Tab-separated table of C-alpha atoms and ligand atoms in Angstrom:
chain	number	residue	atom	x	y	z
A	5	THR	CA	-99.631	-11.355	-201.982
A	6	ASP	CA	-97.592	-12.773	-199.105
A	7	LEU	CA	-97.982	-11.391	-195.585
A	8	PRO	CA	-94.509	-10.417	-194.289
A	9	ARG	CA	-93.610	-12.201	-191.048
A	10	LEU	CA	-91.377	-10.726	-188.334
A	11	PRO	CA	-88.601	-11.324	-187.614
A	12	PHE	CA	-87.113	-10.842	-191.097
A	13	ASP	CA	-83.942	-12.607	-192.238
A	14	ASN	CA	-80.764	-10.506	-192.359
A	15	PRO	CA	-77.884	-12.050	-194.367
A	16	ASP	CA	-75.465	-9.621	-192.644
A	17	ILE	CA	-74.561	-9.493	-188.955
A	18	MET	CA	-75.581	-5.812	-188.810
A	19	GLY	CA	-77.937	-3.446	-190.565
A	20	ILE	CA	-81.594	-3.703	-191.544
A	21	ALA	CA	-83.206	-6.826	-192.977
A	22	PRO	CA	-83.712	-6.478	-196.762
A	23	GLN	CA	-87.483	-7.142	-196.480
A	24	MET	CA	-87.908	-4.256	-194.039
A	25	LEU	CA	-86.051	-1.846	-196.325
A	26	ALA	CA	-88.287	-3.151	-199.115
A	27	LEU	CA	-91.376	-2.351	-197.050
A	28	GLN	CA	-89.933	1.080	-196.233
A	29	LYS	CA	-89.569	1.792	-199.950
A	30	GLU	CA	-93.226	0.942	-200.601
A	31	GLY	CA	-94.584	3.124	-197.804
A	32	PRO	CA	-94.555	4.156	-194.144
A	33	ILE	CA	-96.817	1.429	-192.710
A	34	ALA	CA	-97.579	-2.214	-193.475
A	35	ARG	CA	-99.568	-4.970	-191.796
A	36	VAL	CA	-97.285	-7.883	-190.881
A	37	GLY	CA	-97.383	-11.138	-188.995
A	38	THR	CA	-95.235	-11.802	-185.951
A	39	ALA	CA	-94.489	-14.726	-183.652
A	40	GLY	CA	-97.680	-13.646	-181.849
A	41	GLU	CA	-100.223	-10.994	-182.851
A	42	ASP	CA	-100.302	-9.363	-186.231
A	43	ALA	CA	-99.127	-5.766	-186.037
A	44	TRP	CA	-98.672	-2.601	-188.053
A	45	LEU	CA	-94.998	-2.084	-188.909
A	46	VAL	CA	-93.950	1.566	-189.317
A	47	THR	CA	-90.561	1.977	-190.983
A	48	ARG	CA	-90.122	5.584	-192.178
A	49	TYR	CA	-88.445	8.202	-189.988
A	50	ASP	CA	-91.130	10.921	-190.158
A	51	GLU	CA	-93.985	8.585	-189.281
A	52	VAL	CA	-92.120	6.700	-186.543
A	53	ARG	CA	-91.124	9.980	-184.873
A	54	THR	CA	-94.682	11.341	-185.157
A	55	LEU	CA	-96.206	8.177	-183.655
A	56	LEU	CA	-93.703	8.050	-180.783
A	57	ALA	CA	-94.988	11.513	-179.779
A	58	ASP	CA	-98.703	10.571	-180.143
A	59	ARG	CA	-100.080	9.804	-176.703
A	60	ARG	CA	-102.874	7.635	-178.140
A	61	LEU	CA	-100.133	5.051	-178.820
A	62	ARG	CA	-98.916	3.582	-175.516
A	63	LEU	CA	-96.858	0.749	-174.090
A	64	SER	CA	-99.778	-0.810	-172.202
A	65	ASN	CA	-102.269	-3.269	-173.717
A	66	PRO	CA	-105.888	-2.014	-173.560
A	67	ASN	CA	-107.553	-5.118	-174.997
A	68	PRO	CA	-109.969	-7.082	-172.766
A	69	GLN	CA	-108.462	-10.417	-173.854
A	70	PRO	CA	-104.734	-9.605	-174.064
A	71	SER	CA	-102.584	-11.928	-176.133
A	72	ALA	CA	-100.065	-14.024	-174.209
A	73	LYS	CA	-96.523	-12.705	-173.758
A	74	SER	CA	-93.228	-14.289	-172.775
A	75	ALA	CA	-92.277	-13.874	-169.124
A	76	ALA	CA	-89.371	-11.736	-170.371
A	77	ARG	CA	-91.633	-9.252	-172.184
A	78	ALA	CA	-94.051	-9.145	-169.253
A	79	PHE	CA	-91.221	-8.202	-166.854
A	80	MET	CA	-89.935	-5.536	-169.251
A	81	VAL	CA	-93.378	-3.951	-169.583
A	82	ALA	CA	-93.980	-4.130	-165.822
A	83	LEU	CA	-90.608	-2.491	-165.075
A	84	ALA	CA	-91.722	0.381	-167.342
A	85	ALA	CA	-95.097	0.691	-165.492
A	86	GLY	CA	-96.959	-0.491	-168.590
A	87	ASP	CA	-98.548	-3.670	-167.202
A	88	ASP	CA	-101.944	-2.097	-166.357
A	89	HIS	CA	-103.461	0.206	-168.974
A	90	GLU	CA	-105.776	1.722	-166.342
A	91	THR	CA	-102.951	2.863	-164.050
A	92	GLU	CA	-100.176	3.482	-166.582
A	93	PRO	CA	-100.864	7.275	-166.864
A	94	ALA	CA	-100.343	7.920	-163.139
A	95	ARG	CA	-97.738	5.190	-162.597
A	96	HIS	CA	-95.658	6.064	-165.663
A	97	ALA	CA	-95.807	9.798	-164.876
A	98	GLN	CA	-94.523	9.044	-161.369
A	99	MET	CA	-91.787	6.774	-162.719
A	100	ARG	CA	-90.367	9.502	-164.943
A	101	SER	CA	-90.738	12.173	-162.254
A	102	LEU	CA	-88.716	10.036	-159.827
A	103	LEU	CA	-86.014	8.820	-162.238
A	104	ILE	CA	-85.227	11.964	-164.274
A	105	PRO	CA	-83.708	13.963	-161.348
A	106	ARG	CA	-81.451	10.983	-160.570
A	107	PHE	CA	-79.455	11.880	-163.688
A	108	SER	CA	-78.598	15.446	-162.720
A	109	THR	CA	-75.863	17.476	-164.380
A	110	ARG	CA	-73.970	17.295	-161.061
A	111	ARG	CA	-74.043	13.505	-161.060
A	112	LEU	CA	-73.288	13.260	-164.793
A	113	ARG	CA	-70.236	15.525	-164.460
A	114	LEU	CA	-68.808	13.416	-161.613
A	115	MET	CA	-69.513	10.205	-163.507
A	116	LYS	CA	-67.948	11.470	-166.738
A	117	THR	CA	-64.659	11.987	-164.865
A	118	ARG	CA	-64.778	8.511	-163.310
A	119	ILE	CA	-65.852	6.942	-166.613
A	120	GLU	CA	-62.888	8.470	-168.468
A	121	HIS	CA	-60.319	7.188	-165.948
A	122	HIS	CA	-62.005	3.774	-165.938
A	123	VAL	CA	-61.772	3.500	-169.727
A	124	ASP	CA	-58.089	4.461	-169.504
A	125	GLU	CA	-57.476	1.650	-167.018
A	126	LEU	CA	-59.573	-0.823	-169.021
A	127	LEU	CA	-57.586	-0.045	-172.171
A	128	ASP	CA	-54.255	-0.276	-170.358
A	129	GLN	CA	-55.217	-3.785	-169.203
A	130	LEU	CA	-56.333	-4.612	-172.744
A	131	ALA	CA	-53.127	-3.215	-174.280
A	132	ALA	CA	-50.951	-5.258	-171.892
A	133	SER	CA	-52.677	-8.592	-172.507
A	134	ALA	CA	-51.758	-11.242	-175.076
A	135	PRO	CA	-54.170	-11.508	-178.035
A	136	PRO	CA	-56.535	-12.988	-178.973
A	137	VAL	CA	-58.700	-11.287	-176.345
A	138	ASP	CA	-62.480	-11.085	-175.924
A	139	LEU	CA	-63.184	-7.360	-176.237
A	140	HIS	CA	-66.802	-7.902	-175.180
A	141	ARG	CA	-65.709	-9.401	-171.841
A	142	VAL	CA	-62.845	-7.031	-170.993
A	143	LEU	CA	-64.200	-3.715	-172.257
A	144	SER	CA	-67.778	-3.658	-173.552
A	145	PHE	CA	-69.145	-5.512	-170.504
A	146	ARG	CA	-66.971	-3.789	-167.940
A	147	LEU	CA	-67.615	-0.062	-168.449
A	148	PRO	CA	-71.473	-0.039	-168.288
A	149	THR	CA	-71.611	-2.422	-165.311
A	150	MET	CA	-69.085	-0.183	-163.547
A	151	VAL	CA	-71.488	2.708	-164.179
A	152	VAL	CA	-74.518	0.862	-162.767
A	153	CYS	CA	-72.491	-0.017	-159.639
A	154	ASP	CA	-71.772	3.715	-159.324
A	155	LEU	CA	-75.447	4.667	-159.788
A	156	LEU	CA	-76.556	2.102	-157.193
A	157	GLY	CA	-73.649	2.774	-154.818
A	158	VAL	CA	-72.386	-0.818	-154.542
A	159	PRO	CA	-68.895	-2.345	-154.804
A	160	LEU	CA	-67.739	-2.960	-158.362
A	161	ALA	CA	-67.456	-6.717	-157.695
A	162	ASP	CA	-71.276	-6.750	-157.403
A	163	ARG	CA	-71.445	-6.611	-161.219
A	164	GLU	CA	-69.999	-10.116	-161.200
A	165	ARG	CA	-73.185	-11.040	-159.369
A	166	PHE	CA	-75.719	-9.135	-161.496
A	167	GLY	CA	-73.937	-8.938	-164.885
A	168	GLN	CA	-75.991	-11.658	-166.642
A	169	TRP	CA	-79.330	-10.751	-165.059
A	170	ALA	CA	-80.642	-8.484	-167.827
A	171	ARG	CA	-79.901	-11.251	-170.347
A	172	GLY	CA	-81.556	-13.892	-168.181
A	173	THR	CA	-84.592	-11.776	-167.282
A	174	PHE	CA	-85.065	-10.925	-170.950
A	175	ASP	CA	-84.636	-14.468	-172.327
A	176	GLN	CA	-87.798	-14.968	-174.412
A	177	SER	CA	-86.956	-18.652	-175.011
A	178	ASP	CA	-87.225	-19.816	-171.380
A	179	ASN	CA	-90.028	-18.497	-169.145
A	180	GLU	CA	-88.738	-20.415	-166.106
A	181	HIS	CA	-85.196	-19.062	-166.415
A	182	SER	CA	-86.547	-15.563	-166.968
A	183	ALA	CA	-88.709	-15.709	-163.812
A	184	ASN	CA	-85.944	-17.328	-161.754
A	185	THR	CA	-83.493	-14.642	-162.827
A	186	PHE	CA	-85.921	-11.794	-162.098
A	187	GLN	CA	-86.447	-13.204	-158.593
A	188	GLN	CA	-82.687	-12.895	-158.009
A	189	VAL	CA	-82.848	-9.279	-159.222
A	190	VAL	CA	-85.721	-8.585	-156.806
A	191	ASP	CA	-83.978	-10.197	-153.823
A	192	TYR	CA	-80.757	-8.294	-154.505
A	193	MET	CA	-82.504	-4.948	-154.827
A	194	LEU	CA	-84.606	-5.479	-151.681
A	195	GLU	CA	-81.337	-6.254	-149.846
A	196	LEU	CA	-79.891	-3.044	-151.281
A	197	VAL	CA	-82.868	-0.880	-150.280
A	198	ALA	CA	-82.696	-2.181	-146.697
A	199	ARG	CA	-78.977	-1.324	-146.567
A	200	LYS	CA	-79.364	2.194	-147.984
A	201	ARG	CA	-82.054	2.932	-145.384
A	202	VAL	CA	-79.398	2.809	-142.641
A	203	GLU	CA	-76.237	3.419	-144.732
A	204	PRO	CA	-77.077	5.957	-147.469
A	205	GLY	CA	-74.583	7.440	-149.881
A	206	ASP	CA	-74.446	9.582	-153.030
A	207	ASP	CA	-76.539	7.205	-155.105
A	208	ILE	CA	-79.990	6.592	-156.599
A	209	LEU	CA	-81.676	4.475	-153.915
A	210	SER	CA	-80.553	6.822	-151.130
A	211	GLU	CA	-82.153	9.724	-153.000
A	212	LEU	CA	-85.378	7.778	-153.592
A	213	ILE	CA	-85.483	6.828	-149.889
A	214	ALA	CA	-85.202	10.527	-148.986
A	215	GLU	CA	-87.814	11.503	-151.602
A	216	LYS	CA	-91.049	13.112	-150.352
A	217	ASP	CA	-89.829	12.599	-146.772
A	218	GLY	CA	-89.981	8.842	-147.216
A	219	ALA	CA	-93.363	8.573	-148.963
A	220	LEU	CA	-92.296	5.665	-151.207
A	221	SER	CA	-92.492	2.059	-150.081
A	222	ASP	CA	-89.468	-0.242	-150.186
A	223	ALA	CA	-91.225	-2.147	-152.983
A	224	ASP	CA	-91.738	1.046	-154.992
A	225	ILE	CA	-88.092	2.049	-154.592
A	226	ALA	CA	-86.797	-1.430	-155.413
A	227	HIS	CA	-88.988	-1.471	-158.533
A	228	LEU	CA	-87.271	1.722	-159.745
A	229	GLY	CA	-83.868	0.287	-158.866
A	230	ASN	CA	-84.705	-2.830	-160.900
A	231	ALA	CA	-85.489	-0.701	-163.952
A	232	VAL	CA	-82.121	1.076	-163.609
A	233	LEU	CA	-80.272	-2.226	-163.185
A	234	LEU	CA	-82.033	-4.066	-166.006
A	235	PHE	CA	-82.319	-1.205	-168.542
A	236	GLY	CA	-79.100	0.531	-167.483
A	237	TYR	CA	-76.154	-1.550	-168.688
A	238	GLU	CA	-76.969	-4.329	-171.192
A	239	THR	CA	-78.036	-2.098	-174.095
A	240	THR	CA	-74.947	0.102	-173.599
A	241	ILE	CA	-72.756	-3.023	-173.686
A	242	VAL	CA	-74.366	-3.913	-177.001
A	243	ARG	CA	-73.711	-0.431	-178.438
A	244	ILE	CA	-69.992	-0.599	-177.552
A	245	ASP	CA	-69.840	-3.910	-179.411
A	246	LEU	CA	-71.764	-2.551	-182.433
A	247	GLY	CA	-69.810	0.711	-182.481
A	248	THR	CA	-66.533	-1.214	-182.469
A	249	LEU	CA	-67.754	-3.457	-185.289
A	250	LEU	CA	-68.962	-0.458	-187.307
A	251	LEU	CA	-65.678	1.448	-186.943
A	252	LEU	CA	-63.737	-1.688	-187.906
A	253	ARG	CA	-65.858	-1.806	-191.113
A	254	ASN	CA	-65.044	1.841	-191.952
A	255	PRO	CA	-61.249	2.266	-191.756
A	256	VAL	CA	-61.242	5.783	-193.258
A	257	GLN	CA	-63.639	7.051	-190.562
A	258	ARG	CA	-61.782	5.052	-187.907
A	259	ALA	CA	-58.495	6.718	-188.919
A	260	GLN	CA	-60.215	10.125	-188.761
A	261	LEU	CA	-61.415	9.350	-185.235
A	262	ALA	CA	-58.020	8.094	-184.088
A	263	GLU	CA	-56.372	11.245	-185.441
A	264	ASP	CA	-59.007	13.567	-183.915
A	265	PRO	CA	-60.789	12.341	-180.763
A	266	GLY	CA	-62.961	15.487	-181.014
A	267	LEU	CA	-64.956	13.544	-183.623
A	268	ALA	CA	-66.112	11.043	-180.985
A	269	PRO	CA	-69.471	12.787	-180.263
A	270	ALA	CA	-70.271	12.661	-183.976
A	271	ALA	CA	-69.044	9.058	-184.193
A	272	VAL	CA	-71.249	8.108	-181.222
A	273	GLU	CA	-74.292	9.600	-182.929
A	274	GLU	CA	-73.539	7.584	-186.094
A	275	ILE	CA	-72.946	4.417	-184.056
A	276	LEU	CA	-76.348	4.773	-182.350
A	277	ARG	CA	-78.081	5.510	-185.662
A	278	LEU	CA	-76.511	2.594	-187.565
A	279	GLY	CA	-75.903	0.168	-184.681
A	280	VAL	CA	-78.464	-2.574	-185.385
A	281	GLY	CA	-77.528	-6.244	-184.959
A	282	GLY	CA	-78.746	-9.492	-186.503
A	283	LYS	CA	-82.474	-9.552	-187.261
A	284	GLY	CA	-82.854	-6.298	-185.291
A	285	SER	CA	-85.896	-7.299	-183.219
A	286	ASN	CA	-84.651	-5.017	-180.426
A	287	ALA	CA	-84.777	-2.022	-182.813
A	288	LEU	CA	-88.586	-2.126	-182.685
A	289	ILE	CA	-90.512	-0.150	-180.061
A	290	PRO	CA	-93.826	-1.953	-179.371
A	291	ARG	CA	-97.060	-0.066	-178.769
A	292	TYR	CA	-100.842	-0.489	-178.674
A	293	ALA	CA	-103.367	1.997	-180.029
A	294	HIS	CA	-105.567	3.367	-177.255
A	295	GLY	CA	-107.535	5.334	-179.853
A	296	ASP	CA	-107.877	5.354	-183.616
A	297	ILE	CA	-104.898	6.890	-185.451
A	298	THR	CA	-104.497	7.568	-189.170
A	299	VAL	CA	-101.057	7.012	-190.734
A	300	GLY	CA	-100.955	8.006	-194.378
A	301	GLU	CA	-104.088	6.356	-195.765
A	302	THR	CA	-104.094	3.622	-193.089
A	303	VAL	CA	-106.304	3.584	-189.985
A	304	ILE	CA	-104.810	2.016	-186.874
A	305	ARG	CA	-107.791	0.942	-184.764
A	306	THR	CA	-108.007	1.062	-180.980
A	307	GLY	CA	-106.463	-2.138	-179.662
A	308	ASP	CA	-104.113	-2.745	-182.599
A	309	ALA	CA	-100.478	-3.590	-181.981
A	310	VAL	CA	-97.895	-1.309	-183.590
A	311	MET	CA	-94.160	-1.937	-184.101
A	312	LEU	CA	-92.233	1.333	-184.481
A	313	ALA	CA	-89.052	0.401	-186.372
A	314	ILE	CA	-86.562	2.899	-184.965
A	315	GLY	CA	-83.731	0.935	-186.592
A	316	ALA	CA	-85.251	1.081	-190.078
A	317	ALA	CA	-86.228	4.732	-189.529
A	318	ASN	CA	-82.633	5.556	-188.552
A	319	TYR	CA	-81.549	4.123	-191.934
A	320	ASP	CA	-84.266	6.080	-193.795
A	321	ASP	CA	-82.813	7.843	-196.846
A	322	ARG	CA	-85.561	10.480	-196.503
A	323	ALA	CA	-84.097	11.573	-193.169
A	324	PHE	CA	-80.389	10.733	-193.659
A	325	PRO	CA	-78.866	11.082	-197.151
A	326	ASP	CA	-77.109	7.802	-198.002
A	327	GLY	CA	-78.760	6.363	-194.941
A	328	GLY	CA	-76.804	3.112	-194.981
A	329	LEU	CA	-73.396	4.831	-194.916
A	330	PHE	CA	-71.333	5.506	-191.802
A	331	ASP	CA	-70.298	9.154	-192.043
A	332	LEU	CA	-69.144	11.083	-188.981
A	333	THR	CA	-68.813	14.245	-191.116
A	334	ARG	CA	-72.580	14.641	-191.674
A	335	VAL	CA	-73.544	18.296	-191.331
A	336	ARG	CA	-76.391	18.769	-188.847
A	337	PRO	CA	-77.765	15.205	-189.028
A	338	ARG	CA	-81.354	14.774	-187.897
A	339	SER	CA	-81.738	13.426	-184.368
A	340	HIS	CA	-81.741	9.657	-184.606
A	341	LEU	CA	-84.423	7.573	-182.905
A	342	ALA	CA	-82.174	5.009	-181.141
A	343	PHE	CA	-83.207	6.357	-177.708
A	344	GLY	CA	-86.825	6.664	-178.795
A	345	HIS	CA	-88.825	9.867	-178.605
A	346	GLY	CA	-91.789	11.363	-176.768
A	347	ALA	CA	-93.280	10.153	-173.499
A	348	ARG	CA	-90.863	7.222	-173.029
A	349	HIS	CA	-87.658	8.840	-174.404
A	350	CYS	CA	-84.747	6.959	-172.793
A	351	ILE	CA	-84.006	8.291	-169.315
A	352	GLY	CA	-80.297	7.354	-169.359
A	353	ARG	CA	-79.498	8.702	-172.844
A	354	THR	CA	-77.169	11.494	-171.693
A	355	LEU	CA	-75.283	9.075	-169.445
A	356	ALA	CA	-75.172	6.470	-172.239
A	357	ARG	CA	-73.711	9.090	-174.611
A	358	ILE	CA	-71.038	9.972	-172.017
A	359	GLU	CA	-70.033	6.298	-171.763
A	360	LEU	CA	-69.879	5.730	-175.525
A	361	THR	CA	-68.068	9.036	-176.091
A	362	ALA	CA	-65.408	8.185	-173.485
A	363	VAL	CA	-64.772	4.761	-175.071
A	364	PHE	CA	-64.561	5.890	-178.680
A	365	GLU	CA	-62.482	8.958	-177.820
A	366	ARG	CA	-59.827	6.485	-176.668
A	367	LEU	CA	-60.176	3.045	-178.252
A	368	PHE	CA	-58.448	3.348	-181.645
A	369	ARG	CA	-55.898	5.856	-180.435
A	370	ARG	CA	-54.922	3.504	-177.617
A	371	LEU	CA	-55.031	0.364	-179.845
A	372	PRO	CA	-54.497	1.520	-183.444
A	373	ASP	CA	-53.995	-2.007	-184.852
A	374	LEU	CA	-57.157	-3.400	-183.220
A	375	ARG	CA	-59.073	-5.816	-185.444
A	376	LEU	CA	-61.244	-8.902	-185.235
A	377	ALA	CA	-59.427	-12.197	-184.639
A	378	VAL	CA	-62.329	-14.145	-186.230
A	379	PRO	CA	-64.473	-13.699	-189.355
A	380	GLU	CA	-67.370	-11.276	-188.891
A	381	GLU	CA	-69.744	-14.032	-190.040
A	382	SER	CA	-68.770	-16.122	-186.998
A	383	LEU	CA	-70.179	-13.471	-184.640
A	384	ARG	CA	-73.610	-14.594	-183.432
A	385	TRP	CA	-76.388	-12.160	-182.538
A	386	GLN	CA	-78.515	-13.625	-179.742
A	387	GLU	CA	-82.050	-13.460	-181.144
A	388	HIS	CA	-83.779	-15.039	-178.116
A	389	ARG	CA	-82.838	-12.134	-175.810
A	390	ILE	CA	-85.038	-9.033	-176.069
A	391	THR	CA	-81.843	-6.961	-175.970
A	392	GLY	CA	-80.015	-9.152	-178.526
A	393	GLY	CA	-76.251	-8.720	-178.418
A	394	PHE	CA	-73.136	-10.715	-179.227
A	395	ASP	CA	-71.760	-13.089	-176.589
A	396	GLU	CA	-68.079	-12.472	-177.519
A	397	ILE	CA	-65.962	-10.258	-179.792
A	398	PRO	CA	-62.491	-11.840	-180.280
A	399	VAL	CA	-59.855	-9.290	-181.253
A	400	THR	CA	-56.170	-8.920	-181.886
A	401	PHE	CA	-54.169	-5.664	-181.713
B	501	HEM	C1	-76.877	3.139	-175.705
B	501	HEM	C2	-77.570	2.673	-174.660
B	501	HEM	C3	-79.113	2.740	-174.606
B	501	HEM	C4	-80.024	2.648	-175.598
B	501	HEM	C5	-79.776	2.385	-177.107
B	501	HEM	C6	-81.334	2.805	-174.993
B	501	HEM	C7	-82.549	2.779	-175.643
B	501	HEM	C8	-83.780	3.062	-175.086
B	501	HEM	C9	-85.042	3.180	-175.803
B	501	HEM	C10	-85.213	3.027	-177.335
B	501	HEM	C11	-86.019	3.439	-174.910
B	501	HEM	C12	-87.521	3.683	-175.218
B	501	HEM	C13	-88.399	2.450	-174.959
B	501	HEM	C14	-89.854	2.745	-175.284
B	501	HEM	O1	-90.135	3.786	-175.952
B	501	HEM	O2	-90.746	1.940	-174.877
B	501	HEM	C15	-85.405	3.481	-173.593
B	501	HEM	C16	-86.055	3.690	-172.398
B	501	HEM	C17	-85.473	3.681	-171.144
B	501	HEM	N1	-84.120	3.729	-170.875
B	501	HEM	FE1	-82.608	3.632	-172.260
B	501	HEM	N2	-81.164	3.002	-173.630
B	501	HEM	C18	-79.815	2.993	-173.363
B	501	HEM	C19	-79.217	3.178	-172.137
B	501	HEM	C20	-79.856	3.425	-170.941
B	501	HEM	C21	-79.207	3.680	-169.676
B	501	HEM	C22	-77.658	3.760	-169.514
B	501	HEM	C23	-80.179	3.853	-168.756
B	501	HEM	C24	-80.067	4.152	-167.241
B	501	HEM	C25	-78.960	3.976	-166.504
B	501	HEM	C26	-81.471	3.697	-169.418
B	501	HEM	C27	-82.724	3.798	-168.838
B	501	HEM	C28	-83.935	3.754	-169.502
B	501	HEM	C29	-85.252	3.726	-168.898
B	501	HEM	C30	-85.529	3.723	-167.382
B	501	HEM	C31	-86.171	3.683	-169.872
B	501	HEM	C32	-87.703	3.638	-169.682
B	501	HEM	C33	-88.318	4.951	-170.193
B	501	HEM	C34	-89.823	4.918	-170.085
B	501	HEM	O3	-90.439	3.835	-170.307
B	501	HEM	O4	-90.393	5.987	-169.763
B	501	HEM	N3	-81.223	3.434	-170.742
B	501	HEM	N4	-84.044	3.256	-173.736
B	502	7PF	C1	-86.459	-0.318	-172.055
B	502	7PF	C2	-85.639	-0.962	-173.177
B	502	7PF	C3	-84.539	-1.845	-172.559
B	502	7PF	C4	-85.038	0.145	-174.068
B	502	7PF	C5	-85.191	-0.308	-175.553
B	502	7PF	C6	-83.968	-0.629	-176.245
B	502	7PF	C7	-83.737	-1.962	-176.315
B	502	7PF	C8	-82.660	-2.519	-176.951
B	502	7PF	O1	-81.841	-1.816	-177.580
B	502	7PF	O2	-82.417	-3.747	-176.914
B	502	7PF	C9	-84.788	-2.687	-175.711
B	502	7PF	C10	-85.316	-3.735	-176.734
B	502	7PF	O3	-86.772	-4.044	-176.593
B	502	7PF	C11	-87.617	-2.965	-176.646
B	502	7PF	O4	-88.853	-3.042	-176.624
B	502	7PF	C12	-86.993	-1.716	-176.633
B	502	7PF	C13	-86.884	-0.936	-177.939
B	502	7PF	O5	-87.821	-0.563	-176.862
B	502	7PF	C14	-85.916	-1.648	-175.519
B	502	7PF	C15	-86.593	-1.710	-174.128
């Protein structure tokens, strides 16, 4: 008997920690220690998907004496309207009602066109440069920040101002840096709301300002803008990095994709399913039980913390045959859980898929000899950031 303690070691730079796969083999749910509270860890696909759809399991903490959280986690939960368990039902319902129509098919069609031309220009700059080059800086970082500038209706150079703010806000190692960074986010977005009130355009804040004939306060609108800024580029950056790394590890699939860019949608779904970095602490969706829930033969009691391991579940052999293998020829693969599921299912997931599809349609056809310029083992997953990520991806081509 030895209580497993999150985060688990991973000897590889990607994939699932061996101890978590070991727990998955024993059963769907295990009690584990963490850096803070003990929690139930749920690792099998069927159970994680069922619990994500169970509205007794919520983001907000119902306990009278809530355990302490990093400033970074507190900001993340507040941006998702989860900071007050008594008001989360109404506030979270309103948040989704106001954000979902911002990602209309009309907007997504226009953005797909602009995204595809942008990737073309990004890859032309890449192809013309002298290697070694940092692919993270010149490609992975640049497309999703371009997209957030488009959503917010600001000049592209603004991403040079806000491009490290998700990382800084979500730095769990430094509460002062996290709070100082979030203040910069807030000031920028309040500036932006005041501008869009007199100079609207075809963008998110302008639509929120017009919503319900102006019923929302500037603070309410800026809060929604902050969620889009802070949730809306960094995780996509990380998936371009992971997808590149995964395709580099699978040359037969990569050659298939280069020969037939029509496989990119399928490749993107495999990248999202298998794209887990380092110790994979970001591939856990945290929840609290607001009522008792039975999982197998285990009772989760009201107030218990629950970690839903979407990464481990996406590797589950019971849901994906040969779950550890990258295979963009899978016939009718189950829907992966990388965007979550249920009440908090990722709001930008169709836009994120358009970005990743546009990149991987193009990348290895534009740069067929692309490869790392450094050993894989030298790439360092940033465990202190809630969103993880690599800081650089040196390549030659
Ligand atoms: C590949 C890139 C992305 C991944 C892997 C991802 C992943 C996720 C996941 C797993 C959740 C669920 C969190 C939970 O259940 O508590 C989520 C929620 C969310 N995502 Fe995404 N996301 C991505 C891109 C985006 C983009 C591009 C946007 C917007 C521009 C966005 C906006 C949001 C928002 C606002 C939420 C909060 C949903 C809620 O709490 O109701 N995400 N995302
Ligand atoms: C709102 C989020 C940014 C989306 C989710 C994906 C993430 C990621 O890929 O890094 C974030 C990591 O931390 C979490 O709690 C998550 C798993 O819910 C995320 C919160």
